[PDB]
Amino acid sequence: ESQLHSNKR
Amino acid sequence: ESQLHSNKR
Ligand SMILES: [Cl-]
């Protein structure tokens, strides 16, 4: 998982 | 799953 996605989630 | 998320995926 990307950091970007982790921040969105 | 949201429709938006389905569409991004
Ligand atoms: Cl997004």
How would you describe this protein?
The structure is a homodimer of 9-residue chains. Helices cover 67% and strands 0% of the residues of chain A. Chain A has 9 residues and is an all-alpha fold. The chains hardly touch.
User: What's the alpha carbon Rg of chain A, rounded to whole Å?
Assistant: 5 Å
Count of separate DSSP helical elements of chain A? 1
Number of strands of chain A: 0
User: Helicity of chain A, in percent?
Assistant: 55-70%
SSE string of chain A: H
Proportion of residues in β-strands of chain A: under 5%
Distance between the termini of chain A: 10 Å
Structural class determined from secondary elements of chain A: mainly alpha
- Anisotropy-based shape of chain A: globular
Bound ions, cofactors and other small molecules, one mention each:
chloride ion
Biggest sheet character of chain A: none
Name the assembly state.
Answer: homodimer
PDB class: metal binding protein
Keywords: miniaturized metalloprotein, MAD on the cobalt edge, metal binding protein
Assembly: dimeric
Entry title: crystallographic structure of mimochrome IV
